Every structure is written in structure tokens, then in C-alpha cells.
Amino acid sequence: TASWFTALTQHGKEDLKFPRGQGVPINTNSSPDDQIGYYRRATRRIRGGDGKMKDLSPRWYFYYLGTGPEAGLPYGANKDGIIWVATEGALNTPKDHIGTRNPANNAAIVLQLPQGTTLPKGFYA
Amino acid sequence: TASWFTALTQHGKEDLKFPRGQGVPINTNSSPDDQIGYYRRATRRIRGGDGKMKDLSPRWYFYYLGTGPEAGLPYGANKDGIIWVATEGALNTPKDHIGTRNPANNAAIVLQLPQGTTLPKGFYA
Amino acid sequence: TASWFTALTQHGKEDLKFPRGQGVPINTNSSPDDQIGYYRRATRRKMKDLSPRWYFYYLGTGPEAGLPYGANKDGIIWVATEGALNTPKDHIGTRNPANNAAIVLQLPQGTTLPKGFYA
Amino acid sequence: TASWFTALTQHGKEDLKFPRGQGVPINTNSSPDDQIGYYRRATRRIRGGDGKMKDLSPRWYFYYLGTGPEAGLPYGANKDGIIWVATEGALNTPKDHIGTRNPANNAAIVLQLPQGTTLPKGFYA
Ligand SMILES: [Zn+2]
Ligand SMILES: [Zn+2]
Ligand SMILES: [Zn+2]
Ligand SMILES: [Zn+2]
């Protein structure tokens, strides 16, 4: 139960957003029907080298529709820390056949977006 | 016992098939002699969104000749859920020196095929 | 919790130093605002006096998290890229060796290094 | 305690060898003086799922002169499973300052040789 992909890191103050049709990570081993899901914000509060509590940049992880922590949400569900992406031609059906990644069995895929798609403002990898 | 590579997912009703000479996954850590093996079908059943049991898209896993669940099958042996692939120059000898992957020690390699490889409808790489 | 980057090794007698605008390690997971910090000298030891290693920390992180940019102190040198903000980089912090590997320290093509430094 | 670099895998029958001046892995964070060491053969015998013993391909790991399992050997020491490499200008002095890698702290560097250099016969990565 992990994302198939590495995270997008939020350095800026804006939540992640993509224009309609953009933001689905490249996965050559998946069908055009599969190209739909959400990014989920994950936050960390950690102790620094000075021994004080610190807020790390929020990280956003991609999950295919009907997988991951919000497997039960339908496409477009309005919820804080959840944003939706879909490529033209994707089917609005759960991607049970893809599921989530077992870190014991598989490494994360480095998240890459199609040439032309730019990371939204304040996002780095 | 695991495949060195991630699966090819069967999205359509066509079984995995390659023309003679095609379908061996790219692996820079292998000789021309080594480019031969089989794909093995794995199917799984889960409870769907309706709460009814359903068959997920079959997955096909590549094993080098003389390794994996069918290590004892000779090249070309007719068995359901087994298909054979070999690159030009590959030797019909067991690939003991490559063996199979231990998930505890190694992550799967992302299965890649040469650009232009013929795949049945509903297969992507 | 360690440096995000591998060390610059001092092979010569010259301490690490960079002209203003140079010396911040390349990190694609950082904004132009973030391109500021210090290198800290670490030295190790029949009896051994091994080449000093200099480790990069973002401003307001690591062993000298409490020092302001430009503080004059032995074994600490300061670097900043054009456009960097003089604010602590708490959001980046330091690396947990248990969770993350060090990034190989790389400098932009053309960066000036003292004699006995290589990157 | 590990090699700084990933292994070269011996698929062929020949031991590793490089022409004089070649075979030192690229390491931009080291001096011209540092460009000298040995590769050391490591072998693995494992029992397969068929209950048969399998000799996995020998792996050759690079260590800087005066580091690693043969830290005590001088440059050119004649010993089975040890082969020597040095770049023009390297100094015949122990590289104590480099030492070996702690896998807990650092990932292996992918072993790279200068563009154009081919791996010796029977070696793959
Ligand atoms: Zn930042
Ligand atoms: Zn799919
Ligand atoms: Zn081989
Ligand atoms: Zn050195």
C-alpha cells in the first residue's frame, strides 16, 4: 500500500492543480483507459538538527481512481488534500487491476509528466 | 520466487502472443545467448464495487528459460498460460546464472520491449 | 539526520571558498528562494589526519541551524545563488540516513573551486 | 562496508581485465591522484526451486587502492579474483580518505566508464 510513483513536493502556498487533461503520470505499462486518479497531500512534522519541531514541505502522491487511501471516492469528490486528474479517453471505472505498490516487491516509478505539461507553480521533484 | 520484471497486463480478450524473434524484455545485464524464456499467466479474483466476486485483468510474467515456476519445461512445450519468446541468436540452454528474483533482496525491473514490438490488442509497454 | 549531499573533499591546503553567487549544490527539488546555506568542515583520524570533508546544509538547518547567513565562524563558509531568500529552510530540513540516500554533490558547469577540490 | 559502485557481472568464462589506463569508475568528486584500485570477484551459489545448486554470475566490485577487503595489498599484487586498474596520473598511495561505503548512509554509485569504452568480453551491467 504505497503510490506507484514518487511525490511532487509543494514548496509554494498553493494546493496542487492541473488543467483539464493534464497531470496523470506517464506509465507506458498501462492502457489509455487507465489514465485517471487523484493526488493526495501527505504532511510531515519532524525534529531538526537543532532539536526543534519543523514542518516539512507537503508531498503529493498519485493514486489511480479506485485505489489507495481514497479507493472509495468517485472521480471529482470534493475533499481537502485530494485533487483529480484524467487524460482524454480515460474510463471513469475503478483501476482495481493496477491497485497500489508493495514497497517489498517494487520500487516507486519516478513521476514524469508528458512534455508540454509543466509542474504547477510552487511544485518541484 | 519472482520474475525479474514487472507484468504485461492483458486488458482485452486476446492472450499474450509474440511473433518468433520478439517479446524478450530488455535487460542490459544479459548476453545475446540469454535472450529466451516464457511468459506465465497469473489471474486473481477480488470483490468489486457491487460486493460481487470478479476476475481482474490477467498479468503475464517473464522468466528466462530453465528458471521460475516452469524451470523444468523445455523451450516450445505446449502448456496453457505459458507462451515462449526467443531473440535471434539466443541459446536453448537453462539460464541458471540469471535465475529468478528474491523480492527480499531486489525490486522488479520495469518490463520494456524494443520500440515497435508487436503486442496483441489490450497489451501496452 | 545528515547533509542532503555528499562531501567536497579538501585534497589541498586551501579551505573551501566560493565567489558570491556560486557554490550551492544542484537540487531539482528546491526553489530559487532555497539556494542558500553553508558548508561545514568535518575532519577524521597508525595515527590518521585524513583530508577534511565539507558538507552543505541549507540556511537554518543542520549543526549551525541557529547561525544567520554570513556569520563569521571557523569551519563554516556561506554560499547563495542570485534570487535566494535569507529565511530558514525548515521545509527542506536535513536528511535522515534511515529514510534517504545522500544526493551526489554537483555544481553548475563553470563553478570556480579552490585547488584540491573536485565536483 | 561496501564498494562505492555497483558491480560488473561476468556472463563469460574470462576474468575481468582492462588495458592499462582504463577501468577506473567515473567519480567527479575525487582527484586525479585517487584514480587507482582493484576489482574483486564475489561469487554466489544458491539452491533453486527445483532443489538444484545454481552458480549465479560472478560479480566484480571496484575498491580504491588501500581500501576494502584487500586494503593490505599493494598495486599489482598477484592474487586470484583481484585485478588492478589505474588512470594516467593516479598516485600509488592508499586512499584511506575515500575508504568504503556504509550502505545505511549512502547508495552505490552506478558504475560508469568514459563514453566510448566498451566493457571487457563477457561483462555486462
Ligand atoms: Zn523550498
Ligand atoms: Zn491497466
Ligand atoms: Zn548470461
Ligand atoms: Zn580523494
From Swiss-Prot, chains A, B, D:
Outline the extent of the CoV N NTD domain.
Answer: 1-125
Outcome recorded upon mutating residue 46 to A: Partial loss of RNA-binding
Question: What residue spans carry the region label Disordered?
Answer: 15-35
Residues bound to RNA: 44, 59, 101
Signal peptide boundaries: none
- RNA-binding: annotated span: 1-125
Q: What is the effect of changing residue 124 to A?
A: Partial loss of RNA-binding
- Posttranslational modification, per the record? ADP-ribosylated. The ADP-ribosylation is retained in the virion during infection. Phosphorylated on serine residues by host GSK3A and GSK3B. This promotes the solubility of homodimers that would otherwise aggregate. Host phosphatase would dephosphorylate the protein during assembly at M bound membranes.
Cellular compartment(s): Virion; Host cytoplasm; Secreted; Host extracellular space
Name the source's superkingdom: Viruses
Assembly description: Homodimer, homotetramer, homooligomer with RNA. Both monomeric and oligomeric forms interact with RNA. Interacts with protein M. Interacts with protein E. Interacts with NSP3; this interaction serves to tether the genome to the newly translated replicase-transcriptase complex at a very early stage of infection. Interacts with host NLRP3 and ABHD8; these interactions disrupt the association between NLRP3 and ABHD8, increasing NLRP3 stability, ultimately leading to increased inflammasome activation.
* Family according to the record: Belongs to the betacoronavirus nucleocapsid protein family.
Q: What does this protein do?
A: Packages the positive strand viral genome RNA into a helical ribonucleocapsid (RNP) and plays a fundamental role during virion assembly through its interactions with the viral genome and membrane protein M. Plays an important role in enhancing the efficiency of subgenomic viral RNA transcription as well as viral replication. Attenuates the stress granules formation by reducing host G3BP1 access to host mRNAs under stress conditions.
Q: What is this protein called?
A: Nucleoprotein
**Gene designation:** N
Q: Where in the full protein does the shown chain start and end, and how long is the full protein?
A: 49 to 173 of 419
From Swiss-Prot, chain C:
Q: Report residue spans for region: RNA-binding.
A: 1-119
Residue span, CoV N NTD domain: 1-119
Q: What is the effect of changing residue 32 to R?
A: In strain: Gamma/P.1
Impact when changing residue 97 to S:
In strain: Omicron/BA.4
**Positions contributing to RNA binding:** 44, 53, 95
The record describes its post-translational modification as: ADP-ribosylated. The ADP-ribosylation is retained in the virion during infection. Phosphorylated on serine residues by host GSK3A and GSK3B. This promotes the solubility of homodimers that would otherwise aggregate. Host phosphatase would dephosphorylate the protein during assembly at M bound membranes.
| Outcome when changing residue 53 to E | Complete loss of RNA-binding
Q: Where is this region: Disordered?
A: 15-35
Q: What is the effect of changing residue 44 to E?
A: Complete loss of RNA-binding
Give the UniProt subcellular location, in the record's own words.
Virion; Host cytoplasm; Secreted; Host extracellular space
Free-text function comment from the UniProt entry: Packages the positive strand viral genome RNA into a helical ribonucleocapsid (RNP) and plays a fundamental role during virion assembly through its interactions with the viral genome and membrane protein M. Plays an important role in enhancing the efficiency of subgenomic viral RNA transcription as well as viral replication. Attenuates the stress granules formation by reducing host G3BP1 access to host mRNAs under stress conditions.
State the similarity comment.
Belongs to the betacoronavirus nucleocapsid protein family.
Known partners and oligomeric status: Homodimer, homotetramer, homooligomer with RNA. Both monomeric and oligomeric forms interact with RNA. Interacts with protein M. Interacts with protein E. Interacts with NSP3; this interaction serves to tether the genome to the newly translated replicase-transcriptase complex at a very early stage of infection. Interacts with host NLRP3 and ABHD8; these interactions disrupt the association between NLRP3 and ABHD8, increasing NLRP3 stability, ultimately leading to increased inflammasome activation.
Please give the name of this protein. Answer: Nucleoprotein
The species is Severe acute respiratory syndrome coronavirus 2 (2019-nCoV)
Lineage start? Viruses, Riboviria, Orthornavirae, Pisuviricota, Pisoniviricetes
**Coding gene?**
N
The portion of the full protein included here is 49 to 173 of 419
